[PDB]
């Protein structure tokens, strides 16, 4: 009975940092959508750790924010043949403030958001965020409309305003052009889970409500009292 | 400062934190070692259950107040305490052999019935623990089996994908909605399949959720005592389902020729300690 | 300054840390802490609650209802097997998608003694019992009661009591058998037989339903932490 | 309760104080005082039909 | 020497850091402190002095002077609204260019209670009473008196008294509201309606105006820091 568990604790399940977001922006002129890249956060992208938040009702943590920022090179003509280290930007903007519409904007000062300035070939940008919510616990279902009416969206798409991480090149790039991509990574600490809940067993379809298509319960045996193998798969 | 501690293999470590944040420092990871039946009588209607049979106490609390210890309202109106805490009776819903499932949605359930429907049609905040008793005659030669349960934050998918669903076949007035045990074909209508529960979890793993079994060998009726479950501590009752029920018979009911063949079922919930906050002069319809 | 040397190790991003890092919110204060009932410590709290095992996991039943209920029927038979399945918790069909295996699936390796409950769903009147027993490896899976009986077993009387319940017992070579199951670290089978045979008055229905329950013994463990081989996506689902 | 010993059901007997119209469908009685009698766990359950009037006495 | 390892999080730039830095003047020495008189040292008590609020905001009015005097002139009505808005401290045309919102404007989330203290201009022998009434979010903005009536409310004498202040009370589901508010986390309207309808005396003008005074009670505060949505630039200014 000296077999305790250790490793089956609420943290240790849950403080592994899974990737959240794949981004991709370039950094030439024109198509100014494609200088910047931006993500409203979510857990629900990603299902590698949609389905570890998705055993307990309420959530309340701490987090551990990473980047790992990777660029290449874009094929054609008139490409670098010498080029110097490039920076990335990386601000938050909190629900209720101002965009960037694209890239070299006014709004890209950050007096009062936390931008982060990362350069290549170092360790990845890390930062910590609080429980940050107006509610007690960052509900992962919830039952009920938006309106008192009973009308707007319906799930868990009306507690999740977090705002958006915009990130962008900081170097002008004169002769070529290069995309990056992005890789978020969020590692939660201090975690209390209330209300467990079964996991889901069909697959996720959507990354806005708890859509799914009726699935199996178990594969298929072959007769109720079927042992499998009684001998190895040879002869 | 300059902690010493153990750790999971003398052996020691010396962390310490060099930031001005609770939120900065490193994650703890470390653990410091004729007969006598029973008769609820609240408000003024009493039942009458069993002497031997176990009522299971919701997540293990009992439904209290709310003190004032965790209150973040500005006025606090008063609550009663006889005028709802009735065992209101909903509708009657019929047993047969080929029955899937109901469900139902009771902060949207109670709203015709009492004066629970009349607090909180005025009110804009709402709490209240219920005391969940659901009934069947039984009898010796009527075999069959049933599974209830109060699931929490039950979130259901859309029949049809890329489509919200409607609050006409989300919820009910009256009635409780079938589970179908195929699939559903409908545009805006809910995915209610009986091996997937709705939520689209294995129907299997409902039991976490304080769940009660009405076999009906071994026992006649099912209370569950479920508390408020929410994060927010207040929130308005007629755009958020605090929990949902759900009976789904795991075994069929089999009768033989010479026995009765209209088995019913009924719900006796009853609201305990309803507090209401932030009366507007609304009267929402 | 200080003359630091920069280790092996330096500018990594291992996943499985514990480091500091600086605040992105400084000063922030948070809303204060409220008791939601259910605070869960362990995972393993979950992996304690029963969930019903789907052991009529045939082909066409699996997408049914049908796939959880047993069948018990009543009448002269005296050899047939109501069930039997490898004790594999991780892998086997039987037990994956239950809620003892889903916590598990996450864990490499398990440890402890897993609990059956049969509840039997039948007419008040009925009267049977049966032999449910665990056979250790060994050698051949049970294939009449003679041969299940030496293993150790129960008898349950369906009458006297409904729910009767099998703790299977650890009896294992290695401290800890790896959820994906070789012939090494495997687990015995486990099965059960007719005693007497379900005895039914006229006035009750001759057939009746069995349906089994699975949790893991307060003595379970897991060793390690990988993907679960059953969700998955494809791009980044909008 | 008269009946076989294998009989099971559930009745509500609901008092309905004067207010305003008798009750016509099992949701209308809910509302008021009431017991769920389970008949196969006790036969004669009791109900104390309680005293709530606007005077101490009321006339025969 | 000392073997250190880099962790994540060096050779950055994050905006909102406290790090020591080497001096650039070194040994210089500063002028001394003088009392310089209203030294503030939060910048809420800023959001505790009064700033009138332009509730005659309509779009002819804002840009004259006349967007800060509401109407209440005299005679039989009884029906008519004098004035009404949403109580949405941050997004409101009526609050947003006032003191207490442009300083909130800068915060993300506002929790606490705003108070409005309505002032009456007027002839000193005119005698009336108003009711103001803050109706939470419920369901239909008042729009008959007997509707206000039911919401918390102020019965204010003009003659008696001039300057009644209503206190805004703060009923709301979280602690913290945002600025931005949506649906959910909104406030409730605010209302006033005519109660005896204004009596000036022959001698007097029959019209009056009733100016609007909006600053936060003591218990406000704010919990995030963002980008005014107010002022803006092009290029470097020159
Ligand atoms: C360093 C710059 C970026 C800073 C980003 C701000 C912090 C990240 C937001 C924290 C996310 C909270 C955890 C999940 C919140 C919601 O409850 C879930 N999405 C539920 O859907």
Same mark, same amino acid.
């Given at each position: +009975?000296?077999?305790?568990? !250790? ?24 198509? /100014? ?8 956060? +979510? ?40 080029? /110097? ?8 903007? /909190? ?5 960037? +519409? ?76 290069? !995309? ?18 079964? /996991? ?17 319960? !178990? ?17 | ?60 609390? @009992? ?38 499932? @109901? @469900? ?43 599974? &209830? ?63 009660? @079994? ?10 569950? &005592? ?60 | 300054? #200080?003359?630091?040397?920069? *280790? ?34 362990? #995972? ?12 009529? %996991? *045939?082909?066409?039943?699996? %997408? ?8 018990? =029927? ?29 916590? #598990? ?21 009925? =009267? ?15 294939? %009449? ?28 070579? =290695? ?20 005693? *007497? ?20 013994? %307060? ?14 996506? =494809?791009?980044?689902?909008?």
């Amino acid at each position: +009975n000296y077999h305790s568990r !250790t490793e089956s604790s609420i943290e240790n399940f849950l403080c592994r940092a899974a990737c959240v977001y794949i981004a991709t922006y370039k950094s030439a002129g024109g198509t /100014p959508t494609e200088r910047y890249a931006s993500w409203r956060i +979510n857990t629900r992208q990603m299902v590698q750790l949609r389905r570890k938040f998705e055993l307990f009702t309420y959530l309340r943590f701490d987090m551990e924010i990473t980047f790992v920022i990777t660029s290449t090179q874009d094929p054609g003509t008139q490409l670098a043949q010498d080029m /110097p280290v490039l920076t990335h930007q990386i601000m938050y903007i /909190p629900p209720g403030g101002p965009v960037p +519409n694209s890239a070299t904007d006014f709004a890209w000062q950050s007096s009062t958001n936390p931008s982060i300035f990362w350069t290549e070939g170092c360790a990845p940008a890390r930062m910590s965020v609080p429980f940050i919510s107006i509610g007690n616990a960052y509900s992962n279902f919830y039952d009920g409309w938006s309106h008192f009416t009973q009308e707007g969206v319906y799930g868990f798409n009306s507690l999740n305003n977090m705002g958006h991480i915009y990130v962008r090149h900081v170097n002008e790039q004169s002769l070529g052009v290069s !995309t990056s991509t992005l890789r978020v990574y969020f590692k939660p600490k201090h975690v209390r889970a209330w209300v467990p809940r079964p /996991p889901r067993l069909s697959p996720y379809v959507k990354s806005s409500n708890v859509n799914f298509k009726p699935t199996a319960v !178990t594969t298929e045996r072959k007769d109720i009292n079927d042992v499998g193998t009684l001998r190895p798969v040879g002869y | 400062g300059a902690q010493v501690s153990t750790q999971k293999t003398t052996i020691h470590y010396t962390n310490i934190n060099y930031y001005k944040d609770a939120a900065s420092n490193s994650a703890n990871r470390q653990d410091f070692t004729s007969d006598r039946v029973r008769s609820i009588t609240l408000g003024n209607s009493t039942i009458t259950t069993q002497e031997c049979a176990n009522v299971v106490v919701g997540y293990g609390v @009992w439904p209290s107040y709310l003190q004032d210890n965790e209150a973040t309202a500005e006025d606090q109106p008063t609550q009663p305490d006889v005028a709802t805490c009735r065992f209101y009776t909903l509708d009657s819903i019929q047993w047969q052999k080929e029955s899937d499932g @109901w @469900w139902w949605k009771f902060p949207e359930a109670l709203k015709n019935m009492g004066l629970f429907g009349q607090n909180m049609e005025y009110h804009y905040l709402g709490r209240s623990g219920y005391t969940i008793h659901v009934q069947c005659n039984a009898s010796k030669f009527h075999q069959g089996c049933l599974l &209830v349960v109060c699931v929490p934050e039950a979130e259901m998918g859309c029949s049809d994908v890329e489509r919200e669903v409607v609050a006409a076949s989300l919820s009910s007035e009256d009635t409780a909605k079938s589970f179908s045990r195929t699939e559903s074909n409908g545009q805006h209508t809910v995915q209610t399949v009986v091996y997937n529960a709705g939520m689209g979890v294995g129907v299997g793993n409902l039991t976490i959720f304080p769940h009660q @079994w009405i076999n009906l060998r071994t026992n006649n009726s099912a209370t569950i &005592v479920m508390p408020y479950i929410n994060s927010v501590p207040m929130d308005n009752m007629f755009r958020h389902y605090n929990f949902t029920l759900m009976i789904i018979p795991f075994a069929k009911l089999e009768y033989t020729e010479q026995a009765s063949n209209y088995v019913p079922i009924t719900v006796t919930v009853a609201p305990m300690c309803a507090e209401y906050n932030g009366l507007r002069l609304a009267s929402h319809q | 300054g #200080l003359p630091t040397m920069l *280790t092996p190790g330096s500018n990594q991003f291992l996943t499985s840390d514990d480091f500091q890092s600086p605040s992105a919110m400084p000063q922030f204060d948070v809303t204060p802490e409220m008791k939601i009932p259910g605070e869960v410590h362990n #995972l393993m709290e979950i992996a304690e609650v029963d969930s019903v095992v789907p052991v009529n %996991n *045939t082909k066409e039943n699996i %997408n049914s209802m049908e796939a959880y209920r047993i069948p018990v =029927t009543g009448g002269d038979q005296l050899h047939t097997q109501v069930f039997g399945f490898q004790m594999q918790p991780g892998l086997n069909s039987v037990f994956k998608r239950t809620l003892l295996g889903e916590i #598990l699936n996450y864990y490499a390796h398990w440890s402890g003694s897993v609990k059956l409950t049969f509840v039997f769903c039948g007419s008040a009147m009925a =009267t049977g019992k049966f032999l449910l027993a665990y056979s250790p490896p060994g050698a051949s899976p049970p294939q %009449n009661r003679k041969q299940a009986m030496l293993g150790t077993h129960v008898i349950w009387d369906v009458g006297l009591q409904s729910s009767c319940v099998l703790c299977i017992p650890w009896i294992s070579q =290695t401290h800890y058998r790896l959820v994906q199951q070789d012939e090494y670290t495997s687990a015995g089978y486990v099965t059960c037989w007719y005693q *007497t045979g379900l005895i039914v008055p006229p006035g009750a229905p001759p057939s009746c339903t069995i349906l089994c329950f699975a949790s893991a013994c %307060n003595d379970f463990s897991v060793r390690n932490l990988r993907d679960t081989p059953f969700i998955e996506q =494809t791009q980044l689902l909008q």
